[PDB]
């Protein structure tokens, strides 16, 4: 229970440090959507955090904030 995606049983112990630190597996970090705490979310490339889908435009990998 290290990946934030509900029911993801990937062993992050053996993942790259990036994934272990941000509590997300490679596939879930790149998924257009995933259920996190019962809510459809996407792993924001620029923030390295899950946000709810309304914070993104369509299929964009990063949320609307221009950093």
């Amino acid at each position: 229970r290290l990946c934030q995606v509900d029911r993801c049983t990937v062993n992050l112990t053996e993942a790259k440090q990036y994934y272990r630190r941000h509590r997300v597996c490679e596939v879930h970090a790149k998924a257009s959507a995933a259920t996190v705490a019962g809510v459809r979310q996407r792993f924001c490339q620029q923030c390295s955090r899950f946000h709810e889908l309304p914070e993104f435009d369509e299929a964009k990998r990063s949320c609307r904030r221009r950093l």
């Binding site: 440090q17 630190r21 941000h22 790149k30 490339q45 390295s48 950093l67």
Partner: protein, 97 residues
Amino acid sequence: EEFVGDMRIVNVNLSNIDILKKHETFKKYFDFTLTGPRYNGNIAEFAMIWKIKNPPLNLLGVFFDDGTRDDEDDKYILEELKQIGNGAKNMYIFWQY
């Protein structure tokens, strides 16, 4: 100086990769456990994970100091990485000897 848009290409020569473990700027972004030179798709701890394709003998890594980009192993050779800065002000290219 070499530029692609508003992005400066900065070649950095190191006697070994261990020097970057003590570099105030770069130390958070390298993954020193990884074999073969990596680039970062974003700005976060340990973010330099994406295998650079067919790297030259002495390439140690690439760090883009801003923006996000396509994040995949064995896709982009070094010359192609210069084209996907996407808002990076500096592309640091780390070399040995």
